[PDB]
Amino acid sequence: RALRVLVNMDGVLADFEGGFLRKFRARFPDQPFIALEDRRGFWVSEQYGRLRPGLSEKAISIWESKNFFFELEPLPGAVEAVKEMASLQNTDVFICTSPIKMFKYCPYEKYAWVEKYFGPDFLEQIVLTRDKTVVSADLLIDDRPDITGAEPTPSWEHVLFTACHNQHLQLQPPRRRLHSWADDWKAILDSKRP
Amino acid sequence: RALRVLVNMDGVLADFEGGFLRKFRARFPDQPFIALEDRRGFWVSEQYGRLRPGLSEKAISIWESKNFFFELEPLPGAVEAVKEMASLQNTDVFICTSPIKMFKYCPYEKYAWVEKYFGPDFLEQIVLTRDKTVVSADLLIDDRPDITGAEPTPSWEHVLFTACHNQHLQLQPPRRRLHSWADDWKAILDSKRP
Ligand SMILES: *OP(*)([O])(=O)O[C][C]1O[C](N2[C]=C([C])C(=O)[N]C2=O)[C][C]1N=[N+]=[N-]
């Protein structure tokens, strides 16, 4: 009866693409890289793997490093928008994020990042899961085009959040985008209310 | 269409109650303690708080310490039962656990513990969340008597897993218990299948 909205973290709240590129270039200044305008497909490591053998493993080593997740910059408007959204009447917001395989730093730093930008009281709103389809909600705002898992008919509508890797993608109607946090996210939420 | 079962971690897979008591007694050998047969109510810290002022904070310091979660022993039969359950046809198992407030070690060690006892491939089955009601499934096996959150009508049936703190509790019918992993968990699952 409160509208429930799942908001993804990497590529929606946290600038994974830009943080990765900067750190990759700083660590591997003699390697070729992929400019953001040229990113295609969800998996960074796969595109880097195509660019030259060995580069996939080098890419992976950036996000496996300590402080990678913690030092991500918020995307413009993201912190303000989610704080406003959570404050709305009849609206519950959860941050729904999928950790990487190597778990030494990533879960911890994701909690630390949410504490930093949203405060201790928001920590209760975090859901860490590899499968978003088993999380029930009205909406999922997420930059990954294809979201699948154990539940063949998730309860949420997936609204595709624009990112460099999906900006050229034609979606199957009636699939819907949120173009950035400057875009009219309130209209999207309202479209789902009784 | 596959049956989905959420299995709680602390007090269902991992022996939180026994690990806590042992470590509390080792660290604070001059303090009064609560024998397991005398545990009542979900919150350890609250019962310890009643036993004497200051003891709540001492209790908390045990599970906030590094290696507390990682060093928990599995409950008897738990690892074998969950491995068998996951291997069943038309049956998906997720481990659904709620981290403590202090997040330095707990998320990380929970992943490390699941890797230790269930293997790397099981890490994909973990859901960390403070709110279990937003996780959709057929069953939730969990030792906490009262499970509430943002979803007033969760999709799962909650089957109460016996623990020292709930063993005397009379439940409102048609609520159901799993008494230990030696008990007939297959019968409970089968009762929910088409
Ligand atoms: O779907 P979600 O929650 O945004 O992110 C999942 C997770 O994928 C990891 N990743 C990302 C890329 C681009 C890649 O090539 N390889 C990966 O393993 C990082 C991302 N966030 N985290 N943790």
Ligand SMILES: *OP(*)([O])(=O)O[C][C]1O[C](N2[C]=C([C])C(=O)[N]C2=O)[C][C]1N=[N+]=[N-]
């Ligand atoms: O409900 P769940 O997933 O088993 O555990 C929640 C979480 O509560 C923490 N806890 C437990 C007691 C008994 C207490 O007094 N105070 C707490 O903060 C530990 C438990 N597991 N974890 N992380």
Ligand SMILES: [Mg+2]
């Ligand atoms: Mg994302």
Ligand SMILES: [Mg+2]
């Ligand atoms: Mg609200």
Ligand SMILES: [Mg+2]
């Ligand atoms: Mg429990």
Ligand SMILES: [Mg+2]
């Ligand atoms: Mg199975």
